[PDB]
């Protein structure tokens, strides 16, 4: 749905759809070359549905074609500085594709704007939908829009006849977080049964390692997900499927 969504919002007014409790394959996101832009940064793009994360965010908007460069880890530029900034430790991928076939009025779309004025660049994932007129000069910009009072919000003119460098592109960026809490989505790899007392390769709820699995007398506390060792290394894990 979010990819085949009929509509997108502006870059400054960028959607942040939270995603949880899924079975993500991403397989359709490999074969489908419909995404002219597909640049995983945190992880190898091929290796996703073999991994999984606590939570994932789907930020969506539509921007100018060239600006796809601006959305990069630590990238610089007006959209990046005034409309949407990526985390320096970006954990995920960026999906962008041309939307001229959709985001183009015959007379040109005015529907998509961008904030080109701000006295302080946004933090990563910050979202400033502020509408108030921007004071360009030093005058007290008192409700009068115009000289020394410029409108920070400027619209894209998306005509079908514009250049590709100016052509509208549909973009969705996914950000992941591989944290301590149980993951909400994991890729399609069917589990197996418990095994005891054998040097085996294991992978629990995404946590990977090798060794021998033993029951323990460890008194976890009813919330405690799992333990670690004084080497900050894993000591014990709880089966998701069994306490």
């Amino acid at each position: 749905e979010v990819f085949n969504a009929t509509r997108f919002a502006s870059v400054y007014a960028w959607n942040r759809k939270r995603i949880s409790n899924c079975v993500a394959d991403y397989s359709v996101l490999y074969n489908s070359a419909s995404f002219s832009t597909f640049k995983c940064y945190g992880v190898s793009p091929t290796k996703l549905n073999d991994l999984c994360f606590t939570n994932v965010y789907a930020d969506s908007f539509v921007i100018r074609g060239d600006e796809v460069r601006q959305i990069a880890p630590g990238q610089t530029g007006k959209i990046a500085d005034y409309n949407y900034k990526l985390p320096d430790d970006f954990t995920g991928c960026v999906i962008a594709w041309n939307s001229n076939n959709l985001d183009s009025k015959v007379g040109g779309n005015y529907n998509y704007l961008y904030r080109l004025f701000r006295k302080s660049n946004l933090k990563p994932f910050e979202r400033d939908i502020s509408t108030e007129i921007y004071q360009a000069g030093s005058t007290p910009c008192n409700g009068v829009e115009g000289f020394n009072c410029y409108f920070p919000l400027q619209s894209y003119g998306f005509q079908p006849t514009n250049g590709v460098g100016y052509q509208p592109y549909r973009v969705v960026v996914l950000s992941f977080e591989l944290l301590h809490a149980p993951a909400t989505v994991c890729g399609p790899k069917k589990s197996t049964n418990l095994v005891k007392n054998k040097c085996v390769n294991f992978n629990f709820n995404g946590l990977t390692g090798t060794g021998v699995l033993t029951e323990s007398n460890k008194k976890f506390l009813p919330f405690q997900q799992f333990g670690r060792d004084i080497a900050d290394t894993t000591d014990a894990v709880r089966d998701p499927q069994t306490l």
Epitope: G107, Y110, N111, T131, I133, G143, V144, E145, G146, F147, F151, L153, S155
Partner: antibody, heavy 106, light 107 residues
């Protein structure tokens, strides 16, 4: 394609109110700036109010606290509501971002 | 409060002559905030020049604007048989957007 049709004009008794209609075709009123322009018979143009697409709106001092402009994105129509009308408000109101003109007699 | 002083109030000219419309403002208008409108009799306002230097889209090249500060000047280098209309200038450098009284182009 691009056309702005004005409506809501007519003769009005003093101190009454009025609501303008400005039907736009081919334009996104919520996405482009809109203003209403009046012209009394034999005078020049007088900018009364303007509405920024994001929602911001302003009114000239002669219509301050008496006029109210808004838009129905549900119909993509520009509206200019004036209250406490008088003789001096008689002017030809055409809506522009121009329209066809709507004579107001009061 | 910016009152635009257009002169002359009337101008009679023959076709092919150069017609200049003068537009002075009571206060200096920053960044050439001057817009020109030509209003045919019984017709709606029609934009001619924007920013006092940028002509409107589709307006003839015979139209030309000039001036800076407290002077705005509209030039029609070669008069046209349909150029005998009222021209009103509008200054939008202040919140009270104001226009000039209009100059009538006669025959």
């Amino acid at each position: 394609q691009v056309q702005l049709q004005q409506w809501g004009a007519g003769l009005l008794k003093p101190s009454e109110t009025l609501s303008l209609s400005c039907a736009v075709y081919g334009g996104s009123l919520s996405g482009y700036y809109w203003s209403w322009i009046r012209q009394p018979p034999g005078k020049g143009l007088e900018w009364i109010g303007e509405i920024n697409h994001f929602g911001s709106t302003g009114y000239n001092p002669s219509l301050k606290s008496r006029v109210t402009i808004s838009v129905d994105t549900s119909k993509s129509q520009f509206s200019v509501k004036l209250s406490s009308v008088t003789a001096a408000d008689t002017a030809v109101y055409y809506c522009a971002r121009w329209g066809q003109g709507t004579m107001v007699t009061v | 409060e910016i009152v635009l002083t257009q002169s002359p109030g009337t101008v009679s000219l023959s076709p092919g002559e150069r017609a200049t419309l003068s537009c002075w403002a009571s206060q200096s208008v920053s960044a050439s905030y001057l817009a020109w409108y030509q209003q045919k009799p019984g017709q709606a306002p029609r934009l001619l020049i924007y920013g006092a230097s940028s002509r409107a889209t589709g307006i003839p090249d015979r139209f030309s604007g000039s001036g800076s500060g407290t002077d705005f000047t509209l030039t029609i280098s070669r008069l046209e048989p349909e150029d005998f209309a009222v021209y009103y200038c509008q200054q939008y450098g202040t919140t009270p957007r104001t226009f000039g009284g209009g100059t009538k182009v006669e025959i």
